[PDB]
Amino acid sequence: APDQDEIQRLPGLAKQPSFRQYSGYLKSSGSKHLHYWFVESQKDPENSPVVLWLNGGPGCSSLDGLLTEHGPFLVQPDGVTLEYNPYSWNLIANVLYLESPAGVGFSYSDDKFYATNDTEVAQSNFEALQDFFRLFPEYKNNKLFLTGESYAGIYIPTLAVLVMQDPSMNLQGLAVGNGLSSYEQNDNSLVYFAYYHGLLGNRLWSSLQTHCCSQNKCNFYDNKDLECVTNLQEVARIVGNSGLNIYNLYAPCAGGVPSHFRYEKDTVVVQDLGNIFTRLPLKRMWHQALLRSGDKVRMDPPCTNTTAASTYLNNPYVRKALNIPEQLPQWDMCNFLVNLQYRRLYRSMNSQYLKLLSSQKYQILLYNGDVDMACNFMGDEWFVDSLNQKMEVQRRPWLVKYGDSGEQIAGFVKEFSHIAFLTIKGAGHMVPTDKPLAAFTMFSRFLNKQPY
Amino acid sequence: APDQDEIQRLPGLAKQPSFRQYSGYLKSSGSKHLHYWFVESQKDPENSPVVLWLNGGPGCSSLDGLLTEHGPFLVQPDGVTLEYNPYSWNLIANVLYLESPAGVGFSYSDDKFYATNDTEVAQSNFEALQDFFRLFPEYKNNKLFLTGESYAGIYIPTLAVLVMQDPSMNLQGLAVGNGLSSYEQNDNSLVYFAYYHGLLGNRLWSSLQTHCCSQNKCNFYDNKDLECVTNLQEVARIVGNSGLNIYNLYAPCAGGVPFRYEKDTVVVQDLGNIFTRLPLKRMWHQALLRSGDKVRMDPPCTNTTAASTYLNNPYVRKALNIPEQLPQWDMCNFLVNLQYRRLYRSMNSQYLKLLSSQKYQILLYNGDVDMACNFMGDEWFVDSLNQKMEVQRRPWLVKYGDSGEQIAGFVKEFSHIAFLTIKGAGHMVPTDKPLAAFTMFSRFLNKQPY
Ligand SMILES: *[C@@H]1O[C@H](CO)[C@@H](O[C@@H]2O[C@H](CO)[C@@H](O)[C@H](O)[C@H]2NC(C)=O)[C@H](O)[C@H]1NC(C)=O
Ligand SMILES: *[C@@H]1O[C@H](CO)[C@@H](O[C@H]2O[C@H](CO)[C@@H](O)[C@H](O)[C@H]2NC(C)=O)[C@H](O)[C@H]1NC(C)=O
Ligand SMILES: *[C@@H]1O[C@H](CO)[C@@H](O)[C@H](O)[C@H]1NC(C)=O
Ligand SMILES: *[C@@H]1O[C@H](CO)[C@@H](O)[C@H](O)[C@H]1NC(C)=O
């Protein structure tokens, strides 16, 4: 391990961690430097799996996964205090949170050119993962698992395909939460999700079925039909521009609008990460004129208050503690420019998953919180079914014993050989944030190869 | 008002109420005495509307609505303490909670014959309302509103049709929460609900679509295809017999996932209202009773201990003016639900009758995560009445202290009838979203846009 990267006295903690945790940079392609924050297992880190965690966006920080989802401690509303987390994934694994690609968070590159794409990001993360192993040679033999969320549903399988070609890396499996596996299956399932979760009504639903469907087949993905598009445009407005929380239908929207943007003092805050209805000829805000206007612009995840986390990370002492070059600009959970200039290239993760499944060496899990609308569970359940694999287990519910309010159904699980699809009932996009104990129980049975 | 009925000092409250409240019996057809518990409006009861509240079952107590939903105070887990409810419906109305029919809660009949049906129940309630007005003549000119939930989706509109005919009663409107307005519409929308909420899977969904549907319609109600029926029986099992809470999909089931036994008491939780057109299936048939064991019926995945423990307190009974000879209070009466005869299959005629006068304000409101009387079944039901659209479907709002203004659900308005959803609430809307429910109720009473 690089002694110079270790975190000695992390602010906001009243009692110091009982496990070692590091913060530094992993070098990647070109002039890239990816900020990592590694937290060792709280029990037997020496023999605990190395678990990579990636958040999505594209252009959003994995320190979101640490500080707000499943890190050993979570930032508090004061943006000053950190409280230990009883459901930390690092209780049983050495977790590496990587801010990728360059420009996201405290990550950067010498030329500061942040326009990128799917292929380059997977190679950058791959090269960074190589660097990690040269900085932590002691973990070269530890079972490695690649995990992530949302857009990492793209990041993870593309990175996994590179890793499988490296015999030095002990790739054992991968898990993706509410991941964007297929834009088509996601966009289509969402329109259905919306009607049946009561957002549309029969009139809208009726026109949609009339203008976008023929047979029991609906095309809510790349339909050009005039009135169909006029209807999908409203569906788009209702789902994400009306004040509803696209990450959790049943939760309030932090700083709720009735629009496609909002102002925060004098900063335009954009919250559309560009992954939904991309193929529809919809009318959208001119995100492209935003940089020319000269107004301050920031991208925040939808219905998410980034204050606590941003307030914590931007504290000089925290930056000092985390070994952050003073020259680096302020931390934001998502980088607007990175997202805006990002180039999506793959249409779906089918080939990657097929390639990983062919080896029959990897443990794969796709898990979705069932009240999320950004990457709804249906689109991902369809995805997994379309892989046409051998079924190992007929759909069934999975349980979690809660602080003795007895075992309760935590969701449903479909198992095939080497791949399982699973739902977390009552959870939104950020499953660990909504259902901490169940997310952990699911994480634990995955690592341990125990049935869910 | 019946002075002798006044609740003078109710046990459990650390501070006495600011409003007068009464507990007694309303006489109805035959040997029947229905226990009522009237709580006056906390503000200007003299001019406040009289609001009847009925729960369902059939065979369950309206005190459930009081003590656990929107009463002025609610029972705490200790089944001893009552805490005031800042979202109480009695903040703006003189609410009348009535235990019905006979045999439910503290209600009874001199002959103890509790087998009944829809027609007898509405007549019974009607005569009870007549008696309430005999006891509280001062409340005769006050606007009357009939509200209820669940099976009261049948109780309420059928009672309103009787009430509509009595000019001495000042009926102004009715409101039904997660009401069973139509067995067919409830069953068909529930299967869709099940799939789109992630309980089914496409392998089961395909089988359903293949055997129960024909030409972009499905019949998940009274379908005669044998494999379709085999699939529907599976859907019924997952929804109401797998560990999921049918009243709120995203909520745990009280007691967890395994027939609660309570030592000489088999607890059954099958009220009998979903998939009624599938082959006969009664959960109690599975009960193996010892000679001397009693069967108690409770709402599915609910714990009735706090309310029952409180209500069976000898002191509580006394302050509530309950005849000492009456049996123990239970939130539901198994025998009443067991002998109950459902006569109406749909409430279309009743609502059309009430809508024809264009004199009553009608509201059907559903919590969208409930699977017993899901919001879609009732949205469909209200759409099927084919009334004039006043308000095109839109979200309605609630200003939260912590959250600021948030979308509380969606509302679609027609002339004299509005359908409204409560986002994130289950079957028992006020229990789930107290502030939204009170907000809705207040806009309803005051004829204000939702
Ligand atoms: C529903 O309940 C009412 C009341 O018991 C039933 O009507 C009674 O039927 C009995 C037997 O036919 C008669 O002796 C009574 O005179 C009737 N009472 C009244 C007020 O009409 C009714 O038949 C029951 N069942 C149905 C299907 O309606
Ligand atoms: C993905 O992004 C990378 C970098 O932004 C692109 O890389 C290529 O860029 C130029 C055009 O080929 C060349 O001058 C670079 O040498 C080349 N770099 C590499 C590593 O190939 C790449 O073309 C992008 N891919 C797509 C499909 O747009
Ligand atoms: C966001 O977080 C900060 C600190 O946690 C808090 O002060 C603020 O009120 C929160 N909500 C909004 C809308 O800013
Ligand atoms: C039911 O509630 C009571 C009191 O509220 C509690 O003591 C009891 O343990 C609960 N039982 C179950 C099965 O939830």
PDB file of N, CA and C in Angstrom, chain A residues 128-207:
ATOM      1  N   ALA A 128      -6.325   2.345 -14.702  1.00  0.00           N
ATOM      2  CA  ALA A 128      -6.330   2.837 -13.328  1.00  0.00           C
ATOM      3  C   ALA A 128      -6.355   1.623 -12.392  1.00  0.00           C
ATOM      4  N   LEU A 129      -7.137   0.607 -12.751  1.00  0.00           N
ATOM      5  CA  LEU A 129      -7.229  -0.618 -11.960  1.00  0.00           C
ATOM      6  C   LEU A 129      -5.859  -1.316 -11.942  1.00  0.00           C
ATOM      7  N   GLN A 130      -5.089  -1.170 -13.021  1.00  0.00           N
ATOM      8  CA  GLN A 130      -3.733  -1.747 -13.102  1.00  0.00           C
ATOM      9  C   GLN A 130      -2.829  -1.008 -12.129  1.00  0.00           C
ATOM     10  N   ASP A 131      -2.955   0.312 -12.109  1.00  0.00           N
ATOM     11  CA  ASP A 131      -2.178   1.142 -11.221  1.00  0.00           C
ATOM     12  C   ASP A 131      -2.472   0.795  -9.759  1.00  0.00           C
ATOM     13  N   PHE A 132      -3.748   0.642  -9.429  1.00  0.00           N
ATOM     14  CA  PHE A 132      -4.156   0.280  -8.076  1.00  0.00           C
ATOM     15  C   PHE A 132      -3.385  -0.961  -7.619  1.00  0.00           C
ATOM     16  N   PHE A 133      -3.363  -1.984  -8.464  1.00  0.00           N
ATOM     17  CA  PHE A 133      -2.678  -3.229  -8.144  1.00  0.00           C
ATOM     18  C   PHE A 133      -1.160  -3.079  -8.056  1.00  0.00           C
ATOM     19  N   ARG A 134      -0.617  -2.028  -8.652  1.00  0.00           N
ATOM     20  CA  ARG A 134       0.808  -1.808  -8.538  1.00  0.00           C
ATOM     21  C   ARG A 134       1.066  -0.996  -7.266  1.00  0.00           C
ATOM     22  N   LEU A 135       0.049  -0.281  -6.790  1.00  0.00           N
ATOM     23  CA  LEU A 135       0.146   0.484  -5.549  1.00  0.00           C
ATOM     24  C   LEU A 135      -0.219  -0.412  -4.357  1.00  0.00           C
ATOM     25  N   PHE A 136      -1.072  -1.413  -4.595  1.00  0.00           N
ATOM     26  CA  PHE A 136      -1.510  -2.366  -3.578  1.00  0.00           C
ATOM     27  C   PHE A 136      -1.295  -3.763  -4.119  1.00  0.00           C
ATOM     28  N   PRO A 137      -0.026  -4.135  -4.330  1.00  0.00           N
ATOM     29  CA  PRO A 137       0.365  -5.441  -4.853  1.00  0.00           C
ATOM     30  C   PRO A 137      -0.133  -6.599  -4.005  1.00  0.00           C
ATOM     31  N   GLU A 138      -0.354  -6.331  -2.724  1.00  0.00           N
ATOM     32  CA  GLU A 138      -0.801  -7.350  -1.783  1.00  0.00           C
ATOM     33  C   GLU A 138      -2.199  -7.876  -2.064  1.00  0.00           C
ATOM     34  N   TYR A 139      -2.967  -7.123  -2.858  1.00  0.00           N
ATOM     35  CA  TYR A 139      -4.332  -7.511  -3.195  1.00  0.00           C
ATOM     36  C   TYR A 139      -4.488  -8.128  -4.572  1.00  0.00           C
ATOM     37  N   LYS A 140      -3.377  -8.378  -5.249  1.00  0.00           N
ATOM     38  CA  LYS A 140      -3.415  -8.970  -6.583  1.00  0.00           C
ATOM     39  C   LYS A 140      -4.090 -10.338  -6.578  1.00  0.00           C
ATOM     40  N   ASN A 141      -4.013 -11.044  -5.453  1.00  0.00           N
ATOM     41  CA  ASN A 141      -4.623 -12.369  -5.337  1.00  0.00           C
ATOM     42  C   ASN A 141      -6.037 -12.375  -4.777  1.00  0.00           C
ATOM     43  N   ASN A 142      -6.491 -11.242  -4.261  1.00  0.00           N
ATOM     44  CA  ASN A 142      -7.837 -11.167  -3.695  1.00  0.00           C
ATOM     45  C   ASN A 142      -8.916 -11.243  -4.798  1.00  0.00           C
ATOM     46  N   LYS A 143     -10.009 -11.960  -4.504  1.00  0.00           N
ATOM     47  CA  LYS A 143     -11.123 -12.083  -5.443  1.00  0.00           C
ATOM     48  C   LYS A 143     -11.587 -10.674  -5.719  1.00  0.00           C
ATOM     49  N   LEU A 144     -11.700 -10.350  -6.990  1.00  0.00           N
ATOM     50  CA  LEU A 144     -12.108  -9.035  -7.415  1.00  0.00           C
ATOM     51  C   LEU A 144     -13.537  -9.062  -7.969  1.00  0.00           C
ATOM     52  N   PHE A 145     -14.321  -8.043  -7.637  1.00  0.00           N
ATOM     53  CA  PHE A 145     -15.693  -7.931  -8.112  1.00  0.00           C
ATOM     54  C   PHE A 145     -15.820  -6.515  -8.618  1.00  0.00           C
ATOM     55  N   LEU A 146     -16.467  -6.332  -9.765  1.00  0.00           N
ATOM     56  CA  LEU A 146     -16.659  -4.988 -10.329  1.00  0.00           C
ATOM     57  C   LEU A 146     -18.149  -4.617 -10.093  1.00  0.00           C
ATOM     58  N   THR A 147     -18.402  -3.544  -9.344  1.00  0.00           N
ATOM     59  CA  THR A 147     -19.757  -3.117  -9.004  1.00  0.00           C
ATOM     60  C   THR A 147     -19.996  -1.639  -9.292  1.00  0.00           C
ATOM     61  N   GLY A 148     -21.260  -1.264  -9.483  1.00  0.00           N
ATOM     62  CA  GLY A 148     -21.572   0.121  -9.781  1.00  0.00           C
ATOM     63  C   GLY A 148     -23.058   0.367  -9.871  1.00  0.00           C
ATOM     64  N   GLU A 149     -23.421   1.565 -10.262  1.00  0.00           N
ATOM     65  CA  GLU A 149     -24.814   1.910 -10.324  1.00  0.00           C
ATOM     66  C   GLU A 149     -25.143   2.871 -11.448  1.00  0.00           C
ATOM     67  N   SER A 150     -26.379   2.768 -11.944  1.00  0.00           N
ATOM     68  CA  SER A 150     -26.915   3.672 -12.958  1.00  0.00           C
ATOM     69  C   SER A 150     -26.164   3.579 -14.284  1.00  0.00           C
ATOM     70  N   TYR A 151     -25.438   4.626 -14.666  1.00  0.00           N
ATOM     71  CA  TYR A 151     -24.695   4.574 -15.928  1.00  0.00           C
ATOM     72  C   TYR A 151     -23.581   3.548 -15.858  1.00  0.00           C
ATOM     73  N   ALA A 152     -23.149   3.196 -14.642  1.00  0.00           N
ATOM     74  CA  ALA A 152     -22.140   2.168 -14.473  1.00  0.00           C
ATOM     75  C   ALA A 152     -22.685   0.839 -14.965  1.00  0.00           C
ATOM     76  N   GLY A 153     -23.943   0.828 -15.400  1.00  0.00           N
ATOM     77  CA  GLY A 153     -24.510  -0.391 -15.930  1.00  0.00           C
ATOM     78  C   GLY A 153     -23.875  -0.560 -17.304  1.00  0.00           C
ATOM     79  N   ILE A 154     -23.356   0.548 -17.837  1.00  0.00           N
ATOM     80  CA  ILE A 154     -22.612   0.576 -19.102  1.00  0.00           C
ATOM     81  C   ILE A 154     -21.118   0.405 -18.717  1.00  0.00           C
ATOM     82  N   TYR A 155     -20.617   1.299 -17.846  1.00  0.00           N
ATOM     83  CA  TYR A 155     -19.229   1.267 -17.338  1.00  0.00           C
ATOM     84  C   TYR A 155     -18.788  -0.128 -16.915  1.00  0.00           C
ATOM     85  N   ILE A 156     -19.520  -0.737 -15.981  1.00  0.00           N
ATOM     86  CA  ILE A 156     -19.175  -2.054 -15.458  1.00  0.00           C
ATOM     87  C   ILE A 156     -18.977  -3.219 -16.434  1.00  0.00           C
ATOM     88  N   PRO A 157     -19.969  -3.539 -17.300  1.00  0.00           N
ATOM     89  CA  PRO A 157     -19.728  -4.666 -18.225  1.00  0.00           C
ATOM     90  C   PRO A 157     -18.609  -4.379 -19.263  1.00  0.00           C
ATOM     91  N   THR A 158     -18.500  -3.138 -19.745  1.00  0.00           N
ATOM     92  CA  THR A 158     -17.437  -2.803 -20.688  1.00  0.00           C
ATOM     93  C   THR A 158     -16.064  -2.960 -19.997  1.00  0.00           C
ATOM     94  N   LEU A 159     -15.963  -2.532 -18.733  1.00  0.00           N
ATOM     95  CA  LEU A 159     -14.725  -2.665 -17.961  1.00  0.00           C
ATOM     96  C   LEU A 159     -14.457  -4.128 -17.641  1.00  0.00           C
ATOM     97  N   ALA A 160     -15.519  -4.872 -17.352  1.00  0.00           N
ATOM     98  CA  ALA A 160     -15.412  -6.291 -17.043  1.00  0.00           C
ATOM     99  C   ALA A 160     -14.840  -7.109 -18.227  1.00  0.00           C
ATOM    100  N   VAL A 161     -15.242  -6.740 -19.438  1.00  0.00           N
ATOM    101  CA  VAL A 161     -14.763  -7.426 -20.625  1.00  0.00           C
ATOM    102  C   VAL A 161     -13.240  -7.262 -20.786  1.00  0.00           C
ATOM    103  N   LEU A 162     -12.695  -6.101 -20.407  1.00  0.00           N
ATOM    104  CA  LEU A 162     -11.249  -5.850 -20.474  1.00  0.00           C
ATOM    105  C   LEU A 162     -10.556  -6.649 -19.383  1.00  0.00           C
ATOM    106  N   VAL A 163     -11.107  -6.572 -18.183  1.00  0.00           N
ATOM    107  CA  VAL A 163     -10.553  -7.289 -17.049  1.00  0.00           C
ATOM    108  C   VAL A 163     -10.462  -8.815 -17.261  1.00  0.00           C
ATOM    109  N   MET A 164     -11.443  -9.395 -17.951  1.00  0.00           N
ATOM    110  CA  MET A 164     -11.431 -10.842 -18.208  1.00  0.00           C
ATOM    111  C   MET A 164     -10.286 -11.252 -19.128  1.00  0.00           C
ATOM    112  N   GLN A 165      -9.758 -10.285 -19.880  1.00  0.00           N
ATOM    113  CA  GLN A 165      -8.640 -10.524 -20.788  1.00  0.00           C
ATOM    114  C   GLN A 165      -7.284 -10.412 -20.051  1.00  0.00           C
ATOM    115  N   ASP A 166      -7.327  -9.991 -18.786  1.00  0.00           N
ATOM    116  CA  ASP A 166      -6.124  -9.871 -17.969  1.00  0.00           C
ATOM    117  C   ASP A 166      -6.113 -11.007 -16.964  1.00  0.00           C
ATOM    118  N   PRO A 167      -5.267 -12.011 -17.197  1.00  0.00           N
ATOM    119  CA  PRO A 167      -5.168 -13.170 -16.303  1.00  0.00           C
ATOM    120  C   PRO A 167      -4.638 -12.856 -14.912  1.00  0.00           C
ATOM    121  N   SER A 168      -3.973 -11.711 -14.756  1.00  0.00           N
ATOM    122  CA  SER A 168      -3.418 -11.299 -13.467  1.00  0.00           C
ATOM    123  C   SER A 168      -4.477 -10.818 -12.477  1.00  0.00           C
ATOM    124  N   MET A 169      -5.634 -10.422 -13.004  1.00  0.00           N
ATOM    125  CA  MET A 169      -6.737  -9.932 -12.201  1.00  0.00           C
ATOM    126  C   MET A 169      -7.699 -11.079 -11.899  1.00  0.00           C
ATOM    127  N   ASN A 170      -7.938 -11.327 -10.612  1.00  0.00           N
ATOM    128  CA  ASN A 170      -8.817 -12.417 -10.181  1.00  0.00           C
ATOM    129  C   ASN A 170     -10.306 -12.038 -10.213  1.00  0.00           C
ATOM    130  N   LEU A 171     -10.795 -11.689 -11.402  1.00  0.00           N
ATOM    131  CA  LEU A 171     -12.197 -11.304 -11.596  1.00  0.00           C
ATOM    132  C   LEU A 171     -13.095 -12.470 -11.226  1.00  0.00           C
ATOM    133  N   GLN A 172     -13.914 -12.254 -10.207  1.00  0.00           N
ATOM    134  CA  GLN A 172     -14.830 -13.268  -9.741  1.00  0.00           C
ATOM    135  C   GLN A 172     -16.283 -12.942 -10.063  1.00  0.00           C
ATOM    136  N   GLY A 173     -16.618 -11.670 -10.208  1.00  0.00           N
ATOM    137  CA  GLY A 173     -17.997 -11.353 -10.508  1.00  0.00           C
ATOM    138  C   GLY A 173     -18.266  -9.897 -10.656  1.00  0.00           C
ATOM    139  N   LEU A 174     -19.521  -9.575 -10.935  1.00  0.00           N
ATOM    140  CA  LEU A 174     -19.964  -8.193 -11.111  1.00  0.00           C
ATOM    141  C   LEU A 174     -21.427  -7.994 -10.683  1.00  0.00           C
ATOM    142  N   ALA A 175     -21.749  -6.808 -10.169  1.00  0.00           N
ATOM    143  CA  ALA A 175     -23.102  -6.486  -9.715  1.00  0.00           C
ATOM    144  C   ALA A 175     -23.404  -5.038 -10.116  1.00  0.00           C
ATOM    145  N   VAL A 176     -24.576  -4.800 -10.705  1.00  0.00           N
ATOM    146  CA  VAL A 176     -24.970  -3.466 -11.162  1.00  0.00           C
ATOM    147  C   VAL A 176     -26.347  -3.091 -10.598  1.00  0.00           C
ATOM    148  N   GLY A 177     -26.453  -1.939  -9.936  1.00  0.00           N
ATOM    149  CA  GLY A 177     -27.731  -1.520  -9.377  1.00  0.00           C
ATOM    150  C   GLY A 177     -28.478  -0.561 -10.265  1.00  0.00           C
ATOM    151  N   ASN A 178     -29.737  -0.853 -10.559  1.00  0.00           N
ATOM    152  CA  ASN A 178     -30.519   0.021 -11.447  1.00  0.00           C
ATOM    153  C   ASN A 178     -29.640   0.537 -12.585  1.00  0.00           C
ATOM    154  N   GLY A 179     -29.036  -0.388 -13.312  1.00  0.00           N
ATOM    155  CA  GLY A 179     -28.147   0.013 -14.381  1.00  0.00           C
ATOM    156  C   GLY A 179     -28.823   0.228 -15.707  1.00  0.00           C
ATOM    157  N   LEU A 180     -28.205   1.064 -16.539  1.00  0.00           N
ATOM    158  CA  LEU A 180     -28.684   1.376 -17.881  1.00  0.00           C
ATOM    159  C   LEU A 180     -28.116   0.332 -18.819  1.00  0.00           C
ATOM    160  N   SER A 181     -28.725  -0.849 -18.841  1.00  0.00           N
ATOM    161  CA  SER A 181     -28.284  -1.948 -19.689  1.00  0.00           C
ATOM    162  C   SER A 181     -28.696  -1.811 -21.161  1.00  0.00           C
ATOM    163  N   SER A 182     -29.859  -1.232 -21.406  1.00  0.00           N
ATOM    164  CA  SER A 182     -30.376  -1.039 -22.744  1.00  0.00           C
ATOM    165  C   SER A 182     -31.287   0.163 -22.721  1.00  0.00           C
ATOM    166  N   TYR A 183     -30.956   1.165 -23.524  1.00  0.00           N
ATOM    167  CA  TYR A 183     -31.748   2.390 -23.623  1.00  0.00           C
ATOM    168  C   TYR A 183     -33.148   2.095 -24.146  1.00  0.00           C
ATOM    169  N   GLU A 184     -33.265   1.148 -25.063  1.00  0.00           N
ATOM    170  CA  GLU A 184     -34.558   0.796 -25.640  1.00  0.00           C
ATOM    171  C   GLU A 184     -35.486   0.132 -24.637  1.00  0.00           C
ATOM    172  N   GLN A 185     -34.991  -0.900 -23.969  1.00  0.00           N
ATOM    173  CA  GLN A 185     -35.770  -1.616 -22.973  1.00  0.00           C
ATOM    174  C   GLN A 185     -36.100  -0.733 -21.782  1.00  0.00           C
ATOM    175  N   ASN A 186     -35.230   0.232 -21.504  1.00  0.00           N
ATOM    176  CA  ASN A 186     -35.423   1.176 -20.415  1.00  0.00           C
ATOM    177  C   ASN A 186     -36.484   2.224 -20.784  1.00  0.00           C
ATOM    178  N   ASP A 187     -36.356   2.840 -21.954  1.00  0.00           N
ATOM    179  CA  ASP A 187     -37.307   3.860 -22.398  1.00  0.00           C
ATOM    180  C   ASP A 187     -38.714   3.300 -22.557  1.00  0.00           C
ATOM    181  N   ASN A 188     -38.825   2.105 -23.142  1.00  0.00           N
ATOM    182  CA  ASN A 188     -40.120   1.438 -23.339  1.00  0.00           C
ATOM    183  C   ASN A 188     -40.793   1.030 -22.016  1.00  0.00           C
ATOM    184  N   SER A 189     -40.082   0.290 -21.159  1.00  0.00           N
ATOM    185  CA  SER A 189     -40.629  -0.156 -19.860  1.00  0.00           C
ATOM    186  C   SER A 189     -41.090   1.007 -18.967  1.00  0.00           C
ATOM    187  N   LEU A 190     -40.414   2.151 -19.087  1.00  0.00           N
ATOM    188  CA  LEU A 190     -40.717   3.361 -18.329  1.00  0.00           C
ATOM    189  C   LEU A 190     -42.075   3.947 -18.646  1.00  0.00           C
ATOM    190  N   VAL A 191     -42.436   3.977 -19.934  1.00  0.00           N
ATOM    191  CA  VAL A 191     -43.733   4.514 -20.322  1.00  0.00           C
ATOM    192  C   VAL A 191     -44.815   3.654 -19.680  1.00  0.00           C
ATOM    193  N   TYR A 192     -44.635   2.344 -19.720  1.00  0.00           N
ATOM    194  CA  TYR A 192     -45.550   1.410 -19.079  1.00  0.00           C
ATOM    195  C   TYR A 192     -45.565   1.644 -17.546  1.00  0.00           C
ATOM    196  N   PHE A 193     -44.373   1.721 -16.963  1.00  0.00           N
ATOM    197  CA  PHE A 193     -44.191   1.960 -15.539  1.00  0.00           C
ATOM    198  C   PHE A 193     -45.048   3.156 -15.133  1.00  0.00           C
ATOM    199  N   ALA A 194     -44.924   4.248 -15.878  1.00  0.00           N
ATOM    200  CA  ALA A 194     -45.654   5.484 -15.612  1.00  0.00           C
ATOM    201  C   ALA A 194     -47.180   5.355 -15.599  1.00  0.00           C
ATOM    202  N   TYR A 195     -47.766   4.648 -16.563  1.00  0.00           N
ATOM    203  CA  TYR A 195     -49.213   4.500 -16.557  1.00  0.00           C
ATOM    204  C   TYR A 195     -49.684   3.682 -15.364  1.00  0.00           C
ATOM    205  N   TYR A 196     -49.045   2.543 -15.145  1.00  0.00           N
ATOM    206  CA  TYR A 196     -49.418   1.641 -14.083  1.00  0.00           C
ATOM    207  C   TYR A 196     -49.090   2.068 -12.671  1.00  0.00           C
ATOM    208  N   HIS A 197     -48.310   3.136 -12.548  1.00  0.00           N
ATOM    209  CA  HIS A 197     -47.946   3.701 -11.251  1.00  0.00           C
ATOM    210  C   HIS A 197     -48.732   4.997 -11.091  1.00  0.00           C
ATOM    211  N   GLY A 198     -49.749   5.146 -11.943  1.00  0.00           N
ATOM    212  CA  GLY A 198     -50.671   6.270 -11.898  1.00  0.00           C
ATOM    213  C   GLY A 198     -50.283   7.662 -12.302  1.00  0.00           C
ATOM    214  N   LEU A 199     -49.320   7.788 -13.195  1.00  0.00           N
ATOM    215  CA  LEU A 199     -48.865   9.117 -13.586  1.00  0.00           C
ATOM    216  C   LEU A 199     -49.499   9.635 -14.853  1.00  0.00           C
ATOM    217  N   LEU A 200     -49.992   8.719 -15.673  1.00  0.00           N
ATOM    218  CA  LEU A 200     -50.550   9.099 -16.959  1.00  0.00           C
ATOM    219  C   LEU A 200     -52.060   9.260 -17.112  1.00  0.00           C
ATOM    220  N   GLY A 201     -52.825   8.228 -16.777  1.00  0.00           N
ATOM    221  CA  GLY A 201     -54.264   8.331 -16.981  1.00  0.00           C
ATOM    222  C   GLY A 201     -54.634   7.633 -18.294  1.00  0.00           C
ATOM    223  N   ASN A 202     -55.888   7.215 -18.443  1.00  0.00           N
ATOM    224  CA  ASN A 202     -56.285   6.493 -19.648  1.00  0.00           C
ATOM    225  C   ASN A 202     -56.312   7.255 -20.956  1.00  0.00           C
ATOM    226  N   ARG A 203     -56.576   8.550 -20.932  1.00  0.00           N
ATOM    227  CA  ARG A 203     -56.599   9.311 -22.174  1.00  0.00           C
ATOM    228  C   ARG A 203     -55.218   9.332 -22.812  1.00  0.00           C
ATOM    229  N   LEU A 204     -54.191   9.682 -22.034  1.00  0.00           N
ATOM    230  CA  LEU A 204     -52.821   9.738 -22.538  1.00  0.00           C
ATOM    231  C   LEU A 204     -52.382   8.339 -22.923  1.00  0.00           C
ATOM    232  N   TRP A 205     -52.626   7.398 -22.037  1.00  0.00           N
ATOM    233  CA  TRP A 205     -52.280   6.042 -22.315  1.00  0.00           C
ATOM    234  C   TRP A 205     -52.939   5.566 -23.622  1.00  0.00           C
ATOM    235  N   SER A 206     -54.210   5.934 -23.805  1.00  0.00           N
ATOM    236  CA  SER A 206     -54.977   5.551 -24.989  1.00  0.00           C
ATOM    237  C   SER A 206     -54.349   6.090 -26.261  1.00  0.00           C
ATOM    238  N   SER A 207     -54.057   7.392 -26.306  1.00  0.00           N
ATOM    239  CA  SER A 207     -53.379   7.975 -27.469  1.00  0.00           C
ATOM    240  C   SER A 207     -52.013   7.321 -27.700  1.00  0.00           C
TER     241      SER A 207
END
